[PDB]
From a paper:
Mutagenesis and biochemical analyses indicate that the hydrophobic cavity and the hydrogen bond network at the entrance of the cavity are essential for complex formation with the geranylgeranyl modification on the Gγ subunit.
The two structures at 1.95 and 2.74 Å resolution were designated Form I and Form II. Gip1(146–310) consisted of seven α-helices designated α0 to α6 from the N terminus. Among them, helices α1 to α6 formed a cylinder-like structure with a centrally located hydrophobic cavity 22 Å in depth and 10 Å in diameter. We noticed that there was a tetrahedral area of electron density at the entrance of the cavity that extended to two long regions of electron. The lipid was surrounded by one water molecule and 22 residues that mostly formed hydrophobic interactions. In contrast to the hydrophobic interior, the surface of Gip1 was relatively charged without any notable hydrophobic regions. Asp208 was one of the residues affected most severely by the substitutions and formed hydrogen bonds with both the side chain of Arg212 and the main chain nitrogen of Leu308 at the rim of the cavity entrance, which connected the C-terminal tail with the α3 helix. For example, the hydrogen bonding partners of aspartic acid, the 208th amino acid residue (Asp208), and Arg212 were Leu308 and Thr304 in Form I but Tyr303 in Form II. The hydrogen bond pattern changes are associated with different configurations of the C terminus of the α6 helix, including a directional change of the side chain at Glu307 (discussed later).
Author numbering: 145 to 310
């Protein structure tokens, strides 16, 4: 995992660290390690084919928008984190989940010419876990304040209005 991590900067590594800690808290260390590796693998591949120009920046638009939508809805729901129960926030969290499903599909479409079918399934499983409404509701109801959802959302919500990759 050394090289994959030196292929993304400190900012991204901190984002992935926050996600990984939350995943640890909601499931287990094995799933957290698998999801960290999967996120790194998908990211590294996308960046690789952007840089080699096998993928054009315009082709990324669909994923970009979807991700930002997802982030935005999480930000909206995070406004009520600690003052409303997750059941009262499903209408927001569902939209986040749906947005990430869109990102999932488009990432699959983006990487089909370059990923073996097993790694396409890896994309599906990774996005399905990270974008799961069950994951979100568990996070919004059952986390301690020390689990630092604030760090993740407060890092994500800076990116909702500007293209993620340009
Ligand atoms: C698994 C998802 C894979 C999606 C792959 C396709 C889309 C890729 C686009 C990624 C853009 C991210 C930029 C962010 C800033 C940054 O960190 O930017 C540094 C590098 C890129 O920098 P650059 O030099 O390219 O700059 C670009 C031009 N300025 O980004 C990264 O390290 C990616 C880090 C991603 C970590 C995501 C973790 C959360 C995702 C799921 C949400 C789960 C919520 C859980 C709620 C409890
Ligand atoms: Na796209």
């Amino acid at each position: 995992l050394s090289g994959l991590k030196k292929l993304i900067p400190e900012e991204g590594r901190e984002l992935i660290g926050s996600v990984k800690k939350i995943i640890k808290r909601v499931s287990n260390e094995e799933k957290a390690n698998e999801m960290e590796k999967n996120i790194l693998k998908i990211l590294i591949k996308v960046f690789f084919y952007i840089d080699s120009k096998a993928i054009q920046i315009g082709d990324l638009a669909k994923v970009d928008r979807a991700l930002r939508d997802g982030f935005n809805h999480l930000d909206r729901a995070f406004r009520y984190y600690g003052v409303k129960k997750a059941a009262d926030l499903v209408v927001i969290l569902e939209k986040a989940s749906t947005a990430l499903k869109e990102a999932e599909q488009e990432t699959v479409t983006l990487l089909t010419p370059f990923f073996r079918p097993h790694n396409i399934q890896l994309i599906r499983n990774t996005f399905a876990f990270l974008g799961s409404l069950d994951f979100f509701t568990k996070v919004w109801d059952d986390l301690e304040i020390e689990d630092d959802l604030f760090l993740l959302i407060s890092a994500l919500n800076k990116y909702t209005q500007i293209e993620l990759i340009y």
